[PDB]
Symmetry: C2
Subunit: 529 residues, 2 copies
Amino acid sequence: TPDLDAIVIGAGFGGIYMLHKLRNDLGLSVRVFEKGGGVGGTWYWNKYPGAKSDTEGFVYRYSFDKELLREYDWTTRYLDQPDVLAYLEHVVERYDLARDIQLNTEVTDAIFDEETELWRVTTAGGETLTARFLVTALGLLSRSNIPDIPGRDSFAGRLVHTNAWPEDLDITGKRVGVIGTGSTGTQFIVAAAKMAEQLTVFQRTPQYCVPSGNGPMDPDEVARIKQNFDSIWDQVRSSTVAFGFEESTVEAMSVSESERQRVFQQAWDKGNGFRFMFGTFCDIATNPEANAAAAAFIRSKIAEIVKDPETARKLTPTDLYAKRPLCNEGYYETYNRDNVSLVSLKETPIEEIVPQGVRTSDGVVHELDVLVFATGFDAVDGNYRAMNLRGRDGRHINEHWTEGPTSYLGVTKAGFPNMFMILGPNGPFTNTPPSIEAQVEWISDLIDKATREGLTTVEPTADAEREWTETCAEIANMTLFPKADSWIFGANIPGKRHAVMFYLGGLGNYRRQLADVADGGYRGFQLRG
Amino acid sequence: TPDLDAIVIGAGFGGIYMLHKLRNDLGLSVRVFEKGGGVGGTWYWNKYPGAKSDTEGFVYRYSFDKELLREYDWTTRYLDQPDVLAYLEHVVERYDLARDIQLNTEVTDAIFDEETELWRVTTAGGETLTARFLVTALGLLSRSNIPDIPGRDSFAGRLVHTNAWPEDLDITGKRVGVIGTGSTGTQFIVAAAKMAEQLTVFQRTPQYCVPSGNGPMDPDEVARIKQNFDSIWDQVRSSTVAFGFEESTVEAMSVSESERQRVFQQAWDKGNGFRFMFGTFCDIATNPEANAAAAAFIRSKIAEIVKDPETARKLTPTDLYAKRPLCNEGYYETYNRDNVSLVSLKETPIEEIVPQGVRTSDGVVHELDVLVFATGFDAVDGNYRAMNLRGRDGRHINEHWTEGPTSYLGVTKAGFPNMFMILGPNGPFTNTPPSIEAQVEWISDLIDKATREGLTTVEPTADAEREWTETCAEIANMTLFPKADSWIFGANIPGKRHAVMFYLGGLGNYRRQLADVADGGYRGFQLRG
Ligand SMILES: Cc1cc2nc3c(=O)[nH]c(=O)nc-3n(C[C@H](O)[C@H](O)[C@H](O)COP(=O)(O)OP(=O)(O)OC[C@H]3O[C@@H](n4cnc5c(N)ncnc54)[C@H](O)[C@@H]3O)c2cc1C
Ligand SMILES: Cc1cc2nc3c(=O)[nH]c(=O)nc-3n(C[C@H](O)[C@H](O)[C@H](O)COP(=O)(O)OP(=O)(O)OC[C@H]3O[C@@H](n4cnc5c(N)ncnc54)[C@H](O)[C@@H]3O)c2cc1C
Ligand SMILES: NC(=O)c1ccc[n+]([C@@H]2O[C@H](COP(=O)([O-])OP(=O)(O)OC[C@H]3O[C@@H](n4cnc5c(N)ncnc54)[C@H](OP(=O)(O)O)[C@@H]3O)[C@@H](O)[C@H]2O)c1
Ligand SMILES: NC(=O)c1ccc[n+]([C@@H]2O[C@H](COP(=O)([O-])OP(=O)(O)OC[C@H]3O[C@@H](n4cnc5c(N)ncnc54)[C@H](OP(=O)(O)O)[C@@H]3O)[C@@H](O)[C@H]2O)c1
Ligand code: NA
Ligand code: NA
Ligand code: NA
Ligand code: NA
Ligand code: NA
């Protein structure tokens, strides 16, 4: 007899829906443990100015409740962090979830007991509880990456990671430095430039930023979108990246030079990063000649927008357009402001952080009241490797992951029975919520089967997991994503294994893999009862 | 304007009473942050078998409320951990405190903002709140000391510190090892011997354990004590150690051999560790001749009780009787059992922890299922030094404490305005609760003065703190305590500064110092409005 049927870790998009399925639909005893002081995951932690969705609001939400789809209003094309947090708090209120979500509670240990065949979970607060089923919704992009830049801790001002933005901090009229120009840094830079006395950007690697097209939502369009939600979610679930647009089936180099310029300009004008990469042509991420045409178009727009030719050059990337697409409102324009300076760390790397700011290699001391680390995440496997997480024969998850992190179907792990992962290693690379929905519903169905049939353990075989690794490696190596040095393949952190950590076959093909496994009596699983 | 009048850290005896004064009596807005999953401090964390008070139950409790003194019942002469925890849970219940205690919440940062003159507090859960007043009840004996014994992490069974004892762990019928024989180790050994198939004790330093005389309380005795509580508490508050017995005023060597034997035998039969040290003669802990006579009596008792002469030899300490007194029921008798073995780490030290147990320098592999670290605490300063705690000029508490931890009166710190410590460095060495009450009441009185008069800051001067260090040094250096290597002077942890960390003048003289300062216009404080 376990203390609980199920323990879920994380109260983001993943954990919130998992608890709903397990407690509300299956009638099981469940507790969520969230180490944060509120629910919302991403949208609790990322309180920094400019924090917002790069999925358009209309499809950055749950689809499973048709009444919620009819009722809930959004006012902006992309959702500000406070509005996403408000939406998730509403979902929690709507299904009476708060009473079974324990906040401020870090799970430090999860130990599979091979005698009882129960999960023994320990918290930082010194609670030990047993559960039959463990669901880890720990976040692909949850564990803060804070590089050990020499002197970092000497800084006399406010030093923060974006994923730890403190609620009291007001940068209005302060001298602000930011390190990093990914999705976090660039949206922060647009907002911060309006507030700061001076904003200094420390950029190691410029990215191919495209317009978001963000602005007010016409409430009459929101009514029409709501009219067509059934067909919109149909298209989302059958797409690769699930961003709510029809993906191009046209090869970039199959059309005229004129047509390529027109298609790119039309996506530039319409906005969205995933639209630019996948709504232009079908081979931007696979054909290197297609990739170079897309990259060239983005460089041409930078040269048009940025007035200082030195700033233009430093903003203009020359590497593969194969990092995760990013978009913003008025990013390049921000660098035309009198109070924004760009420091290329390619030219003048950081030598040392000092009480008064940042000394770069040219010996210039950038005087700062606030230093912001927009330096990203120990992505995918970060919160797994930091946990004392042990399966059969008492083996730690790290012992299994010496060649990079692994899974079966992105949701299970050989040697870890009755353990399910929401966006574990080697799952889909998409607009997040519909991928979360696919995993949570499939996991719920298998937990319901194990309940009805009296199954004591369900686990994938080592062979099924190895074949899933091979399937992900085969798909990945036909794209340019492995040659971009991003968080996606673990190349953002010194000493992290460069490895496939996603199934890159898209939501459509991912959903088919899940369905065929379930159809075939849970192919690759040993079900015991 | 702060978010809260006061933030309190810790929900042991100290934080609970401090919240009661500030919320219930002064009517301030207050929150307690406790990183533990429940209230009780010591009595939450120490879930190990045998865990119990070495203060007799009648005075191991609050005195401030006559109604609670009249009502609450205890059934054993010493309080088992579940019974002390239930008492503290009842206190939280009856005083309506739970609504203002936030569990699972570790304070990572407390930063004095010199511009606002407010404390900025950050939680591991990502809350930042401001308070005018900060009270740290972090515990003298709260931060677990776990030595880096070679191969420790390789142990294949259940390895636990006593202060992290997991609720699920049943040692019944298992091969158990324990490292340590202080108050924790010895009370655990008595309880664990009745459960374990085999209990191996890894003893580096045997101590002068005396009988507790624990057993059932006659309910007529409890009724008798409650009728006399006013005179019992008056004697406690003007005593030195506050254990509820009259302290001897007779010099051990001023009486005959026969009288020394009679007085020692009397204390031995009556029981209690502090009774033996301070209830026999006035100079056991100050006069090395008196110390020797007390030590010799205890050794003679070990020889009587322990049947195997080799075991008796290993149990018999030959160093100063100048570590904290410790008492148990049937400790030496436990070693007459067939399932208890004693390893002297003086003779055969631990060379390595291996998957199957412990290898001593005699090459013996001790085979264990469970390895218990009864290795004590980073005492007094542990939880302060681990905090990002900063005062005036942005200085970390560590920068103030390079020659050991310091305070003014054990409750304030120079450079740290509006910050108060419950059992901070250089406070009393007593039965805990009456010392906690003296400090909480003094702190409440000064916060109440500060509120009434509109004071923005209260702080001790550097000079007042330096004088308090010297006072504590003068008193400490007239005792044998500094000559014996124990947690009391920081000598239990490699690399930790050997320094005075207590005022050893006793509760009566400590209370006089607090009163003289307050009545004398807060001598040594700068009060600012
Ligand atoms: C600023 C920002 C904007 C983004 N915008 C988009 C977007 O527009 N579109 C998109 O598709 N994706 C976006 N993402 C990616 C984003 O991660 C997902 O959209 C989604 O929010 C993730 O939900 P989740 O529940 O999987 O994880 P999270 O929201 O990260 O939740 C995981 C939770 O687990 C908790 N946790 C982890 N380990 C433990 C532990 N051991 N014990 C207890 N709790 C633990 C964490 O505290 C966290 O709250 C964005 C990310 C960021 C940072
Ligand atoms: C087994 C045992 C028995 C004892 N018996 C006796 C006895 O009989 N008589 C006696 O006089 N003394 C005894 N002691 C000493 C004991 O410490 C005190 O009696 C008393 O319990 C201490 O109360 P406190 O509130 O000062 O500290 P604690 O009870 O230690 O409470 C401090 C709390 O602060 C919390 N905390 C610390 N840092 C942070 C942070 N950064 N954020 C959030 N929370 C934090 C900790 O989690 C802890 O719960 C005993 C100790 C032990 C271990
Ligand atoms: N618009 C949105 O909705 C939004 C916003 C925030 C984040 N997100 C999500 O979160 C993901 C992560 O984005 P992110 O911007 O937080 O992280 P990221 O994409 O990994 O970017 C981190 C940035 O920090 C830099 N950096 C890392 N280590 C450094 C070091 N030692 N010195 C200097 N610079 C260093 C990186 O440069 P290098 O390339 O040289 O390593 C890069 O510019 C996104 O891809 C997206 O999925 C979304
Ligand atoms: N009321 C009670 O019954 C009770 C019970 C528990 C604790 N307490 C309180 O808590 C305090 C702490 O007592 P405690 O027993 O937890 O700790 P302690 O008195 O500090 O004892 C620690 C023990 O561990 C040993 N040890 C430490 N490091 C070691 C190492 N590296 N290798 C081997 N042995 C090692 C010590 O021996 P060395 O000295 O040789 O290193 C000692 O025997 C008590 O003094 C008391 O105030 C009270
Ligand atoms: Na909200
Ligand atoms: Na996603
Ligand atoms: Na089974
Ligand atoms: Na000792
Ligand atoms: Na005894």
